[PDB]
Coordinates of C-alpha atoms and ligand atoms in Angstrom, one line a residue:
Chain T
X1 CA -19.0 -6.8 -8.2
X2 CA -18.3 -5.5 -4.7
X3 CA -21.1 -3.6 -3.1
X4 CA -19.0 -0.4 -3.5
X5 CA -19.1 -1.0 -7.2
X6 CA -21.5 1.9 -7.8
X7 CA -20.0 4.1 -5.1
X8 CA -16.5 3.7 -6.7
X9 CA -17.8 4.3 -10.2
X10 CA -19.6 7.5 -9.1
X11 CA -16.4 8.6 -7.3
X12 CA -14.2 7.9 -10.3
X13 CA -16.6 9.9 -12.3
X14 CA -16.1 12.8 -10.0
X15 CA -12.3 12.5 -9.9
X16 CA -11.9 12.2 -13.7
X17 CA -13.3 15.8 -14.0
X18 CA -10.6 17.1 -11.7
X19 CA -7.3 15.3 -12.6
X20 CA -8.2 16.9 -16.0
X21 CA -5.4 18.5 -18.1
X22 CA -5.7 21.5 -20.3
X23 CA -7.2 20.3 -23.6
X24 CA -5.1 22.8 -25.7
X25 CA -1.9 23.0 -23.6
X26 CA 0.3 21.8 -26.5
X27 CA -0.4 25.0 -28.5
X28 CA 1.0 27.0 -25.6
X29 CA 4.1 24.7 -25.4
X30 CA 6.9 26.8 -26.9
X31 CA 9.1 23.8 -27.9
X32 CA 7.3 20.5 -27.9
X33 CA 4.6 19.1 -30.2
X34 CA 2.0 16.4 -30.3
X35 CA 4.3 14.3 -32.4
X36 CA 7.0 14.5 -29.8
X37 CA 4.5 13.5 -27.2
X38 CA 3.4 10.6 -29.3
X39 CA 7.0 9.4 -29.6
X40 CA 7.3 9.7 -25.8
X41 CA 4.2 7.7 -24.9
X42 CA 5.1 5.1 -27.5
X43 CA 8.5 4.7 -25.9
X44 CA 6.9 4.3 -22.5
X45 CA 4.8 1.5 -23.9
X46 CA 8.1 -0.2 -24.9
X47 CA 9.5 0.4 -21.5
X48 CA 6.4 -1.1 -19.9
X49 CA 6.9 -4.2 -22.1
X50 CA 10.6 -4.4 -21.2
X51 CA 10.1 -4.3 -17.4
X52 CA 6.8 -6.1 -17.4
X53 CA 4.8 -3.3 -15.8
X54 CA 1.0 -3.2 -15.5
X55 CA -1.1 -1.4 -18.1
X56 CA -2.4 0.7 -15.2
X57 CA 1.1 2.1 -14.7
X58 CA 1.4 3.2 -18.3
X59 CA -2.0 5.0 -18.1
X60 CA -1.1 6.7 -14.8
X61 CA 2.2 8.0 -16.2
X62 CA 0.6 9.4 -19.3
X63 CA -1.9 11.2 -17.0
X64 CA 0.9 12.5 -14.9
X65 CA 2.7 13.8 -18.0
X66 CA -0.2 15.6 -19.6
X67 CA -1.0 17.3 -16.3
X68 CA 2.6 18.3 -15.8
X69 CA 2.9 19.7 -19.3
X70 CA -0.4 21.4 -18.7
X71 CA 1.4 23.8 -16.4
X72 CA 5.1 23.6 -17.2
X73 CA 7.0 24.6 -20.3
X74 CA 9.4 21.9 -21.2
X75 CA 12.1 21.8 -23.9
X76 CA 12.7 18.9 -26.4
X77 CA 15.7 17.8 -24.4
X78 CA 13.9 17.5 -21.1
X79 CA 10.7 15.9 -22.3
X80 CA 12.1 12.3 -21.8
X81 CA 13.2 13.3 -18.3
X82 CA 9.7 14.2 -17.4
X83 CA 8.5 11.0 -19.0
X84 CA 11.0 8.9 -17.1
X85 CA 10.1 10.5 -13.8
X86 CA 6.4 10.0 -14.5
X87 CA 6.9 6.3 -15.2
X88 CA 9.0 5.9 -12.1
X89 CA 6.3 7.6 -10.0
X90 CA 3.4 5.6 -11.5
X91 CA 5.5 2.4 -10.7
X92 CA 6.0 3.3 -7.1
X93 CA 2.3 4.0 -6.9
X94 CA 0.9 1.0 -8.8
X95 CA 3.5 -1.8 -8.9
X96 CA 4.1 -4.3 -6.1
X97 CA 7.8 -4.1 -7.0
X98 CA 8.8 -1.0 -8.8
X99 CA 12.0 -1.0 -10.9
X100 CA 14.8 0.8 -9.2
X101 CA 16.0 4.3 -10.2
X102 CA 19.1 2.8 -11.8
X103 CA 16.9 0.8 -14.1
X104 CA 15.0 3.9 -15.2
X105 CA 18.3 5.7 -15.7
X106 CA 19.4 2.7 -17.8
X107 CA 16.5 2.8 -20.3
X108 CA 17.2 6.4 -21.1
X109 CA 20.7 5.5 -22.4
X110 CA 22.4 7.7 -19.9
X111 CA 20.8 10.8 -21.4
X112 CA 20.2 11.7 -17.8
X113 CA 21.6 11.2 -14.3
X114 CA 20.2 9.3 -11.4
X115 CA 20.4 12.7 -9.8
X116 CA 18.4 14.3 -12.6
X117 CA 15.7 11.7 -12.6
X118 CA 15.2 12.1 -8.8
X119 CA 15.2 15.9 -9.0
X120 CA 12.6 15.7 -11.8
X121 CA 10.6 13.2 -9.6
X122 CA 10.6 15.8 -6.8
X123 CA 9.5 18.5 -9.2
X124 CA 6.7 16.4 -10.7
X125 CA 5.4 15.6 -7.2
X126 CA 5.4 19.3 -6.5
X127 CA 3.5 20.2 -9.7
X128 CA 0.9 17.5 -9.3
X129 CA 0.9 18.2 -5.6
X130 CA 1.2 14.5 -4.8
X131 CA -2.2 13.8 -6.3
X132 CA -1.3 10.5 -8.0
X133 CA -4.4 8.4 -7.5
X134 CA -5.8 9.4 -10.9
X135 CA -8.7 7.8 -12.9
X136 CA -7.6 6.0 -16.1
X137 CA -9.4 4.6 -19.1
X138 CA -8.0 1.3 -17.8
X139 CA -9.9 1.6 -14.5
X140 CA -13.2 2.3 -16.3
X141 CA -12.7 -0.6 -18.7
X142 CA -12.3 -2.8 -15.6
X143 CA -15.6 -1.5 -14.3
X144 CA -17.3 -2.0 -17.6
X145 CA -16.0 -5.6 -18.0
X146 CA -18.2 -6.8 -15.2
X147 CA -21.3 -5.8 -17.1
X148 CA -20.2 -8.1 -19.9
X149 CA -22.7 -10.9 -19.9
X150 CA -20.7 -13.4 -21.9
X151 CA -17.2 -12.5 -20.7
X152 CA -14.9 -12.7 -23.7
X153 CA -11.1 -12.5 -23.4
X154 CA -10.7 -11.2 -27.0
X155 CA -13.2 -8.4 -26.4
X156 CA -11.4 -7.3 -23.2
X157 CA -8.0 -7.5 -25.0
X158 CA -9.3 -5.5 -28.0
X159 CA -10.8 -2.8 -25.7
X160 CA -7.5 -2.5 -23.9
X161 CA -5.8 -2.2 -27.2
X162 CA -8.1 0.6 -28.4
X163 CA -7.9 2.4 -25.0
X164 CA -4.1 2.2 -25.2
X165 CA -4.0 3.6 -28.7
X166 CA -5.8 6.7 -27.4
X167 CA -2.9 7.4 -25.1
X168 CA -0.6 8.1 -28.1
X169 CA -2.5 11.0 -29.8
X170 CA -3.2 14.1 -27.7
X171 CA -5.3 15.3 -30.6
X172 CA -8.2 14.4 -30.3
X173 CA -8.2 12.2 -27.3
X174 CA -7.2 14.9 -24.8
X175 CA -10.7 16.3 -25.2
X176 CA -12.6 13.2 -24.1
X177 CA -13.2 11.9 -20.5
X178 CA -11.5 8.5 -19.6
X179 CA -15.0 7.0 -19.0
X180 CA -16.1 8.1 -22.4
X181 CA -13.0 6.8 -24.2
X182 CA -13.4 3.5 -22.2
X183 CA -17.0 3.4 -23.3
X184 CA -16.1 3.9 -27.0
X185 CA -13.3 1.3 -26.7
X186 CA -15.6 -1.2 -25.1
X187 CA -18.4 -0.8 -27.7
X188 CA -16.0 -0.9 -30.6
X189 CA -14.2 -4.0 -29.2
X190 CA -17.5 -5.7 -28.5
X191 CA -18.9 -4.9 -32.0
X192 CA -15.7 -6.0 -33.8
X193 CA -15.4 -9.3 -32.0
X194 CA -19.0 -10.4 -31.3
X195 CA -21.3 -8.1 -33.3
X196 CA -22.9 -7.0 -30.1
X197 CA -23.4 -3.4 -29.1
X198 CA -23.0 -1.1 -26.0
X199 CA -25.0 -3.2 -23.4
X200 CA -28.2 -2.0 -21.8
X201 CA -26.7 -2.5 -18.3
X202 CA -23.8 -0.2 -19.0
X203 CA -26.2 2.5 -20.4
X204 CA -28.0 2.4 -17.0
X205 CA -24.7 2.3 -15.1
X206 CA -22.9 5.1 -17.0
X207 CA -25.7 7.1 -18.3
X208 CA -24.0 7.0 -21.7
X209 CA -26.0 6.0 -24.8
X210 CA -24.6 4.7 -28.0
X211 CA -25.6 8.2 -29.3
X212 CA -23.6 10.1 -26.7
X213 CA -20.5 8.0 -27.3
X214 CA -20.7 8.6 -31.1
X215 CA -18.3 11.5 -31.3
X216 CA -15.5 9.7 -29.5
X217 CA -16.5 6.5 -31.3
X218 CA -16.1 8.1 -34.7
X219 CA -12.6 9.3 -33.7
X220 CA -11.6 5.9 -32.2
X221 CA -12.9 4.0 -35.3
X222 CA -10.6 6.1 -37.5
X223 CA -7.7 5.6 -35.2
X224 CA -8.4 1.9 -35.3
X225 CA -8.6 1.9 -39.1
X226 CA -5.3 3.8 -39.6
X227 CA -3.5 2.1 -36.7
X228 CA -1.3 0.1 -39.1
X229 CA 0.1 3.2 -40.8
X230 CA 0.7 5.2 -37.6
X231 CA 4.3 6.3 -37.1
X232 CA 4.2 4.8 -33.6
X233 CA 3.8 1.0 -33.6
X234 CA 4.7 -0.1 -30.0
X235 CA 1.1 -0.8 -29.0
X236 CA 0.2 -2.9 -32.1
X237 CA 3.4 -4.9 -31.6
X238 CA 2.5 -5.3 -27.9
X239 CA -1.0 -6.5 -28.7
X240 CA -0.1 -9.1 -31.3
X241 CA 1.2 -11.2 -28.4
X242 CA -0.4 -14.5 -27.2
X243 CA -1.3 -12.9 -23.8
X244 CA -3.5 -10.4 -25.8
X245 CA -4.8 -13.0 -28.3
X246 CA -3.1 -11.0 -31.1
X247 CA -6.1 -8.7 -31.2
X248 CA -4.1 -6.0 -32.9
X249 CA -4.2 -8.2 -36.0
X250 CA -8.1 -8.3 -36.1
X251 CA -9.7 -6.3 -38.9
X252 CA -11.7 -3.3 -37.8
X253 CA -15.3 -3.2 -39.2
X254 CA -15.6 -1.1 -42.3
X255 CA -18.6 0.7 -40.9
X256 CA -19.9 1.3 -37.4
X257 CA -23.5 1.6 -38.5
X258 CA -24.2 4.0 -35.7
Chain R
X1 CA 10.4 24.4 2.9
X2 CA 13.2 25.0 5.5
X3 CA 11.2 28.0 6.6
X4 CA 8.3 25.7 7.5
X5 CA 10.5 23.3 9.5
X6 CA 11.8 26.4 11.4
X7 CA 8.2 27.0 12.6
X8 CA 8.1 23.6 14.3
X9 CA 9.2 22.9 17.8
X10 CA 9.8 19.3 18.7
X11 CA 8.1 18.0 21.9
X12 CA 8.5 14.3 22.4
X13 CA 9.4 11.3 20.2
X14 CA 5.9 9.7 19.9
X15 CA 7.4 6.7 18.2
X16 CA 9.5 5.5 15.2
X17 CA 10.7 2.6 13.2
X18 CA 11.8 1.8 9.6
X19 CA 9.6 4.5 8.1
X20 CA 11.4 7.2 10.1
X21 CA 10.5 8.9 13.4
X22 CA 7.2 10.3 14.7
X23 CA 7.6 13.3 17.0
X24 CA 4.9 15.3 18.8
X25 CA 5.6 18.9 17.6
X26 CA 4.2 22.4 18.2
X27 CA 3.7 25.1 15.5
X28 CA 5.6 28.1 16.8
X29 CA 3.4 30.6 15.1
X30 CA -0.1 29.1 15.6
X31 CA 0.4 27.0 18.7
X32 CA -1.1 24.0 16.8
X33 CA 0.1 20.6 18.0
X34 CA 0.9 18.1 15.3
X35 CA 2.4 14.7 14.8
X36 CA 5.6 15.0 12.7
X37 CA 6.7 11.9 10.9
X38 CA 10.3 12.3 9.7
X39 CA 11.5 10.1 6.9
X40 CA 15.3 10.0 6.1
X41 CA 15.7 9.8 2.3
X42 CA 19.3 8.8 2.0
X43 CA 18.6 5.3 3.5
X44 CA 18.3 4.1 -0.1
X45 CA 18.7 7.1 -2.4
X46 CA 16.0 5.6 -4.5
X47 CA 13.9 8.7 -4.1
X48 CA 10.8 8.6 -1.9
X49 CA 9.7 5.3 -0.3
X50 CA 6.6 3.6 -1.8
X51 CA 4.8 3.6 1.5
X52 CA 5.2 7.4 1.6
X53 CA 4.0 7.7 -2.0
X54 CA 0.9 5.7 -1.1
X55 CA 0.1 7.1 2.3
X56 CA 0.3 10.6 1.0
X57 CA -1.6 10.4 -2.3
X58 CA -4.3 8.2 -0.8
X59 CA -4.5 10.1 2.5
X60 CA -4.8 13.5 0.9
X61 CA -7.8 12.1 -1.0
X62 CA -9.6 10.8 2.0
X63 CA -11.2 13.6 4.0
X64 CA -13.4 12.1 6.8
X65 CA -13.8 12.7 10.5
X66 CA -12.7 9.1 11.2
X67 CA -9.5 9.2 9.2
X68 CA -6.3 10.9 10.5
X69 CA -5.8 14.2 8.7
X70 CA -2.6 14.9 6.8
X71 CA -2.0 18.6 7.2
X72 CA 1.2 19.1 5.2
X73 CA 4.1 17.5 3.4
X74 CA 7.5 19.1 3.5
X75 CA 10.0 17.7 1.0
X76 CA 13.6 18.8 1.7
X77 CA 16.8 17.5 0.1
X78 CA 17.5 14.7 2.5
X79 CA 14.3 14.4 4.5
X80 CA 10.5 14.1 3.9
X81 CA 8.1 15.3 6.6
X82 CA 4.5 14.2 6.9
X83 CA 2.6 16.6 9.2
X84 CA -0.5 14.9 10.7
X85 CA -3.1 16.3 13.1
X86 CA -2.1 15.1 16.5
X87 CA -4.2 12.6 18.6
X88 CA -3.4 11.8 22.2
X89 CA -3.2 8.0 22.1
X90 CA -3.6 4.7 20.1
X91 CA -6.2 2.0 20.7
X92 CA -3.5 -0.6 21.7
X93 CA -2.1 1.5 24.6
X94 CA -5.7 2.4 25.6
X95 CA -6.7 -1.3 25.8
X96 CA -3.8 -2.0 28.1
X97 CA -4.8 0.8 30.4
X98 CA -8.4 -0.5 30.5
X99 CA -7.3 -4.0 31.3
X100 CA -8.5 -3.9 34.9
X101 CA -11.7 -2.0 34.5
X102 CA -12.5 -2.9 30.9
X103 CA -13.7 -0.6 28.1
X104 CA -17.4 0.4 28.6
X105 CA -19.7 -1.2 26.1
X106 CA -21.1 2.1 25.1
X107 CA -17.6 3.4 24.2
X108 CA -16.8 0.1 22.5
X109 CA -19.9 0.5 20.3
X110 CA -19.0 4.2 19.7
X111 CA -15.6 3.2 18.6
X112 CA -16.7 0.4 16.3
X113 CA -19.3 2.6 14.8
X114 CA -16.8 5.3 14.0
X115 CA -14.2 2.8 12.6
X116 CA -16.9 1.3 10.4
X117 CA -17.6 4.8 9.0
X118 CA -14.0 5.7 8.2
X119 CA -13.6 2.3 6.7
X120 CA -16.8 2.5 4.6
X121 CA -15.5 5.9 3.4
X122 CA -12.2 4.2 2.4
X123 CA -13.8 1.4 0.5
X124 CA -16.2 3.7 -1.3
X125 CA -13.1 5.6 -2.5
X126 CA -11.5 2.4 -3.6
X127 CA -8.9 2.3 -0.8
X128 CA -7.9 -0.8 1.2
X129 CA -6.2 -0.1 4.5
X130 CA -4.8 -3.6 4.7
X131 CA -3.3 -3.0 8.2
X132 CA -6.1 -2.4 10.6
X133 CA -4.8 -3.3 14.0
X134 CA -5.1 -1.6 17.5
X135 CA -1.9 0.5 17.3
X136 CA -2.8 2.0 14.0
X137 CA -6.1 3.3 15.4
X138 CA -5.9 6.7 17.1
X139 CA -8.2 8.2 19.7
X140 CA -8.5 11.7 21.2
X141 CA -10.0 13.0 24.4
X142 CA -13.3 13.8 22.8
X143 CA -14.3 10.2 22.3
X144 CA -13.4 10.1 18.6
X145 CA -11.4 7.4 16.9
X146 CA -9.6 7.5 13.6
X147 CA -8.0 5.1 11.1
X148 CA -4.3 6.0 10.7
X149 CA -1.0 4.7 9.3
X150 CA -1.8 4.1 5.6
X151 CA 1.6 2.9 4.6
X152 CA 0.3 -0.4 3.3
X153 CA -2.9 1.1 1.9
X154 CA -3.8 0.3 -1.8
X155 CA -6.1 1.9 -4.3
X156 CA -8.1 -0.9 -5.9
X157 CA -9.4 0.6 -9.2
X158 CA -7.5 -2.4 -10.4
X159 CA -7.5 -5.7 -8.3
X160 CA -4.7 -5.7 -5.7
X161 CA -2.6 -8.9 -5.8
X162 CA -1.6 -10.9 -2.7
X163 CA 1.9 -10.0 -1.5
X164 CA 3.9 -11.8 1.2
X165 CA 5.9 -8.9 2.6
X166 CA 3.0 -6.4 2.7
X167 CA 0.3 -8.0 4.9
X168 CA -1.6 -7.3 8.2
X169 CA 0.2 -8.5 11.3
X170 CA -0.8 -12.1 11.8
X171 CA -3.4 -11.8 14.6
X172 CA -5.6 -9.7 12.4
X173 CA -5.0 -11.5 9.1
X174 CA -8.1 -12.8 7.3
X175 CA -8.4 -16.6 6.6
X176 CA -8.5 -16.0 2.8
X177 CA -5.1 -14.5 3.0
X178 CA -3.8 -17.4 5.1
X179 CA -5.3 -20.0 2.8
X180 CA -3.5 -18.2 -0.1
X181 CA -6.1 -16.3 -2.1
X182 CA -4.9 -14.4 -5.2
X183 CA -6.3 -11.0 -4.5
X184 CA -7.3 -8.8 -1.5
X185 CA -10.8 -7.4 -1.2
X186 CA -12.5 -5.0 1.2
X187 CA -13.4 -8.0 3.4
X188 CA -9.9 -8.4 4.7
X189 CA -10.4 -5.0 6.5
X190 CA -13.8 -6.0 8.0
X191 CA -12.2 -9.1 9.4
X192 CA -9.5 -7.1 11.1
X193 CA -12.2 -4.9 12.6
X194 CA -14.1 -7.9 13.8
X195 CA -11.1 -9.2 15.7
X196 CA -10.5 -5.8 17.2
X197 CA -14.2 -5.6 18.1
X198 CA -14.0 -8.9 20.0
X199 CA -10.7 -7.9 21.5
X200 CA -12.2 -4.8 23.1
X201 CA -15.2 -6.8 24.4
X202 CA -13.2 -9.5 26.1
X203 CA -9.9 -7.7 26.9
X204 CA -8.0 -10.3 25.0
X205 CA -6.9 -10.9 21.4
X206 CA -9.3 -13.2 19.5
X207 CA -6.8 -15.2 17.4
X208 CA -3.2 -14.8 18.8
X209 CA -1.4 -17.1 16.4
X210 CA 2.3 -18.0 16.6
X211 CA 2.7 -19.0 13.0
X212 CA 0.5 -18.9 9.9
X213 CA -0.7 -22.4 10.5
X214 CA -1.2 -21.8 14.3
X215 CA -3.2 -18.7 13.3
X216 CA -5.4 -20.7 10.9
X217 CA -6.0 -23.3 13.5
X218 CA -7.0 -21.0 16.3
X219 CA -9.6 -19.6 13.9
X220 CA -10.8 -23.1 12.9
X221 CA -10.9 -24.0 16.6
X222 CA -13.3 -21.1 17.3
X223 CA -15.3 -20.6 14.1
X224 CA -15.0 -24.2 13.0
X225 CA -13.1 -25.8 10.2
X226 CA -14.7 -24.4 7.0
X227 CA -16.1 -26.8 4.4
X228 CA -17.4 -26.3 0.8
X229 CA -20.9 -25.7 2.1
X230 CA -19.9 -22.9 4.4
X231 CA -17.3 -21.4 2.0
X232 CA -17.8 -22.5 -1.6
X233 CA -14.2 -23.1 -2.9
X234 CA -12.2 -23.4 0.3
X235 CA -11.0 -26.9 -0.4
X236 CA -9.6 -25.7 -3.7
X237 CA -7.4 -22.9 -2.2
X238 CA -3.6 -22.9 -2.5
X239 CA -2.9 -23.6 1.2
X240 CA -6.0 -25.6 2.1
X241 CA -5.1 -29.1 3.1
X242 CA -7.8 -31.8 3.4
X243 CA -5.8 -33.1 6.3
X244 CA -7.1 -30.1 8.4
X245 CA -8.4 -31.3 11.8
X246 CA -12.2 -30.8 11.6
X247 CA -13.3 -28.7 14.5
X248 CA -16.8 -27.6 15.4
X249 CA -18.1 -24.0 15.6
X250 CA -17.8 -22.7 19.2
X251 CA -20.8 -21.0 20.7
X252 CA -20.4 -17.2 20.3
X253 CA -22.1 -16.7 23.7
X254 CA -19.0 -18.4 25.1
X255 CA -16.4 -16.6 22.8
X256 CA -17.7 -13.0 23.4
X257 CA -19.8 -13.5 26.6
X258 CA -20.2 -9.7 27.4
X259 CA -22.1 -9.2 24.1
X260 CA -25.9 -9.2 23.8
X261 CA -27.8 -10.8 20.9
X262 CA -27.1 -8.0 18.4
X263 CA -23.5 -7.7 19.3
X264 CA -23.0 -11.4 18.6
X265 CA -24.9 -11.1 15.4
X266 CA -22.7 -8.4 14.0
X267 CA -19.4 -10.0 15.1
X268 CA -20.3 -13.3 13.5
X269 CA -21.1 -11.4 10.2
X270 CA -17.8 -9.6 10.4
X271 CA -16.1 -13.0 10.9
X272 CA -18.0 -14.8 8.2
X273 CA -15.6 -17.3 6.3
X274 CA -16.7 -16.7 2.7
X275 CA -15.2 -13.2 2.0
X276 CA -18.1 -12.8 -0.5
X277 CA -20.6 -13.3 2.2
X278 CA -18.8 -11.2 4.9
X279 CA -20.6 -8.1 5.9
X280 CA -19.6 -4.7 4.3
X281 CA -18.7 -1.7 6.4
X282 CA -21.6 0.1 4.8
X283 CA -24.1 -2.7 5.7
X284 CA -22.5 -3.0 9.2
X285 CA -23.3 0.6 10.0
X286 CA -27.0 -0.4 9.5
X287 CA -26.9 -3.3 12.0
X288 CA -29.4 -3.0 14.9
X289 CA -26.4 -3.1 17.2
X290 CA -25.8 0.6 16.5
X291 CA -29.5 1.4 17.1
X292 CA -28.7 3.4 20.3
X293 CA -25.1 4.4 19.6
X294 CA -23.7 7.4 21.6
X295 CA -20.3 9.2 21.7
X296 CA -18.9 8.7 25.3
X297 CA -15.5 10.2 26.1
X298 CA -12.7 7.9 27.0
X299 CA -10.8 8.0 30.3
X300 CA -7.4 8.7 28.8
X301 CA -4.2 8.3 30.9
Ligands
514_401 C1 1.6 6.8 12.7 C2 0.9 8.1 12.3 O1 0.8 8.4 11.1 N1 0.4 8.9 13.3 C3 0.5 8.6 14.7 C4 -0.2 9.8 15.3 C5 -0.6 10.6 14.4 C6 -0.3 10.2 13.0 N2 -1.2 11.7 15.0 N3 -1.2 11.5 16.2 C7 -0.6 10.3 16.6 N4 -0.4 9.9 17.9 C8 0.3 8.8 18.3 O2 0.8 8.0 17.5 C9 0.4 8.4 19.7 C10 0.1 7.1 20.2 C11 0.2 6.8 21.5 C12 0.6 7.8 22.5 C13 0.9 9.1 22.0 C14 0.8 9.4 20.7

């Protein structure tokens, strides 16, 4: 808990309200849909697994993508190009050793050129005006994990899992703030694994009450419940690993009793 | 893009390197003088360098009087230009020029005070500079000093892991890094400042190591060889050898003679061994040493 713990939290709370994408941008997209987006983010999860990239990179790339699609009409055929460039950019920003362009061109099955990917990289930087240091659900979970009295690995893994599942469905997660989704994911994971609830310390820190997190929590619980029958399965597959204590296999409570 | 470059008139190649080149340029329309950093992009055809990616996104998110200002970014097809506000000189060259006369304590205090403010601003915005050294610090004729060169800066919303090819030049490297710690923290930056603080006061570098081990030793030789009582956990660090010669803690009054009581108090807190106990930039700005701080103008050459 550095002494800038509060300063940073407060600052991330400010930033999260600005790197904010248009909640209903998909309606205005002439050719793409939420389902197409879901397939894209799912694929990026797989790419993250393949190249052993940090979870933070995945979260940053999804942020870049929603912000780009928030102000750019893209056709089915170019959507993966935007996704690839976004992933490449988040890597350069977050990873110590980012995969080389050639590797990114590789995982797209030569659907695009090294030339195309780099051009798209340039365009994405232009649209986001080089503002890549975005707040993620991931960053808030990190913050919240410190206020976890009995630090539990399974709780942290499950929260990560839930936060990652929210990245797949624009509807309804695009309408919630990262700090709020992180809050819901934390409580839900905490409850599922230890029976404990959103901690008093976090209420003071975030200003969020179990009551305020309810809306998001209701949505997240449902996503958790139906996770096994979702068309996209990359995240569950990812989280049934030893590294994550196979938390995707845990049974979600039948009721939240909120 | 090309229309913008047309409005710039080159003046003199400030410096250069691997990144690219850094010219002093003049805006033909406004007369404004800027520092133009040219980066050739075909020297890899991997897109934009990671240092550019980080310096830009992080710099254009750090607006503070004590942090160099990135005015613009021009991305052409083969080159990438970073347009910075121009400052007359860096702290390294300034220290050389002040070798004979020395830098006035009031100016030293003014500079440390400012550096601590830009640094505190960085850390409170989750940014680690990770390369605070004299040449990366810029000063102007008004007595102001600013943190610059953010090529190795990292955002730490998520812990930043220790990397071998991306570290502060040896003389300013913190002991935790030398002893092989797993992550960086804001303390690594305070340690660099502490070394620069002392270097300004004495006119000579505090720990001029020749190797990683020689560096460690010069530090042990002055601050004393750390033990579990002074730094809980040292003995259990990756590169800590029990065979380390046990030295005693030199008397600060003899290390930084020119400094008064407060000056010594602050420096010792900036050079504390346990990174968890090392003073924060925020806290440092509250030290009695800055009780009577002023903003003198330098005697630039
Ligand atoms: C490296 C960098 O990003 N910047 C360097 C400078 C910037 C921005 N703005 N002004 C700079 N001035 C100098 O570097 C300089 C140093 C000694 C003598 C003359 C000029």
